[PDB]
Amino acid sequence: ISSVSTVESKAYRDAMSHYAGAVQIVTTAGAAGRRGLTLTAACSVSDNPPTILICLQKIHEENRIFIENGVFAINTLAGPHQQLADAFSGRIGLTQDERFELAAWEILATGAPVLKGALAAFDCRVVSVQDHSTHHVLFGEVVGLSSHAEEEALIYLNRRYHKLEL
């Protein structure tokens, strides 16, 4: 099995279009500045201690800001957050500052922007930074937490956004 080729990137992306993802906006703030981006490549690693990972495209050099600040917050998006998901995916242009202006943010522990009205927010300190081909994989220990009882979760699946009732 070590000698066989990996599948084609296109075929893989097409298959991954069948793999739903809860839409997050991952954020950071600190000496390197404030940045956010719409993200689905994240998951929980452990509950003890609470640890989550995110995958950031290397091709966008501004993603280094997360590493430099050594903190990030994962904000789980709800029904009313389509505009924000679009802003933070680069769909509508705008500067980072202009993108943040579109909603109200607060903080938990690290200073990374936490979305008011998020389904959940996980505020993290970076504990591992890894290079995996096209992406940095950052592991974070969860040092701040919020959750709110919103009616719907924002989910990406089959190349479009969906709202799913909790």
Ligand X SMILES: Cc1cc2nc3c(=O)[nH]c(=O)nc-3n(C[C@H](O)[C@H](O)[C@H](O)COP(=O)(O)O)c2cc1C
What does the per-residue mask of binding to ligand X show for 117-146, with x meaning CB under 6 A? ------------------------------
Taking the least distance from each CB to ligand X, the nearer of 54 and 121 is 54
Q: Cα separations (Å) of 48 from 37, 114, 125, 142, 155?
A: 27, 23, 15, 10, 27
Q: Give every CB contact of residue 74 below 8 A, 6+ residues apart in sequence.
A: 24, 26, 39, 42, 52, 54, 121, 122, 124, 140
- How many residues belong to the chain? 166
96 is in an annotated binding site: yes
Taking the least distance from each CB to ligand X, the nearer of 147 and 158 is 158
> Which of 55, 108, 124, 142 is close enough to bind ligand X by CB under 6 A?
55
What does the per-residue mask of binding to ligand X show for 84-103, with x meaning CB under 6 A? ----xxx-------------
Please tell me the distance from the alpha carbon of residue 150 to that of residue 42, in angstroms, as a whole number.
Answer: 21
Outline where the chain has alpha helix (H): 9-16, 64-69, 82-88, 96-100
Taking the least distance from each CB to a second copy, the nearer of 94 and 127 is 127
Report yes or no: 112 and 72 within 8 Å, Cβ to Cβ. Answer: yes
How many C-beta atoms surround the C-beta of residue 36 within 10 A? 24
Q: Which stretch binds ligand X (CB under 6 A): 7-15, 38-46, 75-83, 119-127?
A: 38-46
The interface with a second copy within residues 104-123 (CB under 8 A) comprises 109-110, 119-122
User: At its nearest, how many Å lie between a second copy and the CB of residue 104?
Assistant: 19
Which positions lie near ligand X, rule CB under 6 A?
23, 37-41, 55-57, 60, 88-90, 156
Known binding residues = 35, 38, 40-41, 44, 47, 55, 57, 88, 96, 99, 135, 159
